[PDB]
Amino acid sequence: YWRFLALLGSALLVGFLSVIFALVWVLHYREGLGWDGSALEFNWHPVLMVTGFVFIQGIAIIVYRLPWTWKCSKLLMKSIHAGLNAVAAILAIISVVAVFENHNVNNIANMYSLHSWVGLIAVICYLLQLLSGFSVFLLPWAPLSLRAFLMPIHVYSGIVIFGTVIATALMGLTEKLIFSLRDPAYSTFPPEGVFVNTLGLLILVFGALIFWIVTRPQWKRPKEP
Amino acid sequence: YWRFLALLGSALLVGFLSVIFALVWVLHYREGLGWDGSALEFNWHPVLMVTGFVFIQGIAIIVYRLPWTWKCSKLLMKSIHAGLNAVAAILAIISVVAVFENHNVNNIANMYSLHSWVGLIAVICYLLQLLSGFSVFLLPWAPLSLRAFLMPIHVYSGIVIFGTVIATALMGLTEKLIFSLRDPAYSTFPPEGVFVNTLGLLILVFGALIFWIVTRPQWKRPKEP
Ligand code: HEM
Ligand code: HEM
Ligand code: HEM
Ligand code: HEM
């Protein structure tokens, strides 16, 4: 228990510092936020991706392992899981609408990067996991046999989508640092560069923590009757 | 069994195509290979990283789950594991010596990027997992109690290092594409750009496959007497 608490506490801390770091970066180092800057719009992209796709999704993935929930309703904890993942799907979609509207308004090319390829698949895989998870594991009519062998795919896919989001995030930080830190150049170790590398590491440590919590068999929600 | 075979076969295929794709890219799209180009030297970096740190390490991680090995010697399969990981440690170190020698000869800055921060920690964590794994699990004097609770950390850390290498690789592809595809620009969808994005996806699919194999409890090497 109290090593779980300490680990949950650590992941919340690093997860909140990531969101904090993403906000300071766009509000104090970049131009800020707005729904047409248009770089004030683009900046919603990293902010909302860190906040929903990395942080809120990180918490949805461990929601069933909070021991205060074990003798809670399984339908209820399915609802918090479903709902916390839906919030991150909304924010991530909004996040992608930000780049497309900044790009199209500014006549920039779309979908040429490995970041955007990996990312757009992450997003599509995410919605499919959300739609499939809703009709099979929340919704009532599905055959309990189809439950039995979709479940290993669903647990694996969620960890693998969550890992791929983190790898897309560090790619997006990389692109945006390189595009932006032209003078002083990124390679000159400017403060924005040290700061956002540290945001990169924080997003890293958060994933490692979420992956630790979620693979402790002693912390699985105890199977139902 | 035969779904394991098919999955092992798939991961070997995508793992070999990654190495192939990394070679074609530097030999047919870039300047080629050499031990002083000096871009002929830098190119050893992605080639050796994909080959040893992603591919050979991907195979070392699943070496205990080959069913042809289950009634093999555990000391022997510890030796293939140890040895396959040592080969990737050598290649990765060599790979890092390539960038430092290209940078220092060409007066480029070192260790300013998130790619290099994450990567250098991956490398250091890798060697520590290798040194710790050698003295605790190959070597004979360690208390069987210290075996018992280092093992969960060692399995977790190997998956987490392997994931972080993949995320570093896609960052390195991102940087190198952006630095290089200046004219025709990356954003103009040039063939090198489509090709190396596809190398990025292949490295992705390889990790997802290695992670699938390595988390099937039905495929764990059956515990010893
Ligand atoms: C993209 C969205 C989703 C992701 C990434 C996701 C991811 C995951 C992950 C990683 C686990 C294993 C966590 C654990 O061991 O506690 C899990 C468990 C589960 N998910 Fe989801 N999930 C998503 C959407 C849904 C939805 C909509 C439902 C519908 C009810 C659902 C139902 C479940 C159930 C029943 C479990 C097993 C709970 C248990 O351990 O007893 N998921 N999910
Ligand atoms: C990890 C979650 C993320 C996902 C799923 C994601 C997904 C995407 C997608 C689909 C695009 C293409 C949009 C377009 O073509 O207009 C894109 C573009 C971009 N993203 Fe992200 N992104 C994520 C995180 C980040 C972060 C944290 C940053 C850092 C600022 C970032 C920086 C960028 C930049 C600069 C572009 C435009 C250049 C390009 O097309 O590659 N992204 N992202
Ligand atoms: C950086 C290098 C290393 C990495 C990334 C690594 C990674 C891993 C991973 C991911 C597993 C779990 C695989 C599975 O379930 O089959 C594992 C298992 C193991 N590793 Fe390592 N390892 C490394 C070095 C070593 C070394 C040097 C030894 C020394 C003998 C060692 C001994 C073991 C043992 C005994 C197991 C458990 C085998 C079993 O399932 O019965 N590893 N390693
Ligand atoms: C995934 C395994 C990888 C690791 C552990 C890794 C690690 C590193 C390290 C430590 C550096 C800094 C070297 C220096 O400062 O001179 C670096 C630089 C670099 N890497 Fe990688 N790398 C990997 C994969 C890749 C790949 C696949 C590419 C694609 C070509 C790449 C491209 C670069 C580039 C262009 C640099 C120099 C610019 C910079 O300092 O960021 N790397 N890498």
Numbering used by the authors:
A (entry chain A), B (entry chain A): 6 to 230
What sentences appear in the manuscript?
Human ferric reductase Dcytb is an essential enzyme for enteric iron absorption and a member of Cytb561 protein family, which has two heme b groups to mediate intramolecular electron-transfer across the membrane. Human enteric ferric reductase Dcytb is a member of the cytochrome b561 (Cytb561) protein family, all of which are ascorbate-dependent oxidoreductases that are homo-dimeric, integral membrane proteins in which each monomer possesses six transmembrane helices and two heme b groups. Dcytb utilizes ascorbate in cytoplasm as an electron donor to reduce apical Fe3+. Since DMT-1 favors the absorption of divalent metal including Fe2+13, the reduction of Fe3+ to Fe2+ by Dcytb in the duodenum is essential for effective intestinal iron absorption.
The resulting crystal belongs to the C2 space group and allowed collection of X-ray diffraction data to a resolution of 2.6 Å. The structure derived from these data was determined by molecular replacement on the basis of the structure reported for Arabidopsis thaliana Cytochrome b561 (AtCytb561), which exhibits 36% sequence identity with human Dcytb. The overall structure of human Dcytb is a homodimer in which each monomer possesses six transmembrane α-helices. The Dcytb dimer exhibits crystallographic twofold symmetry in which the monomers interact through hydrophobic contacts involving transmembrane helices α5 and α6 on the cytoplasmic side and helices α4, α5 and α6 on the apical side. Although full-length Dcytb (residues 1–286) was used for crystallization, the atomic model includes only residues 6–230 because the electron density map for the five N-terminal residues and the 56 C-terminal residues was disordered. The two heme b groups of each Dcytb monomer are sandwiched between four central transmembrane helices (α2−α5) at the apical (or luminal) and cytoplasmic ends of the structure and are referred to as such. As expected from the electronic absorption spectrum, each heme is hexacoordinate with H86 and H159 coordinating the iron of the cytoplasmic heme and H50 and H120 coordinating the apical heme iron. The A-propionate of the cytoplasmic heme forms a salt-bridge with the side chain of R70 from α2, and the corresponding D-propionate is exposed to the solvent. The closest edge-to-edge distance between the two heme groups within a monomer is 15.5 Å.
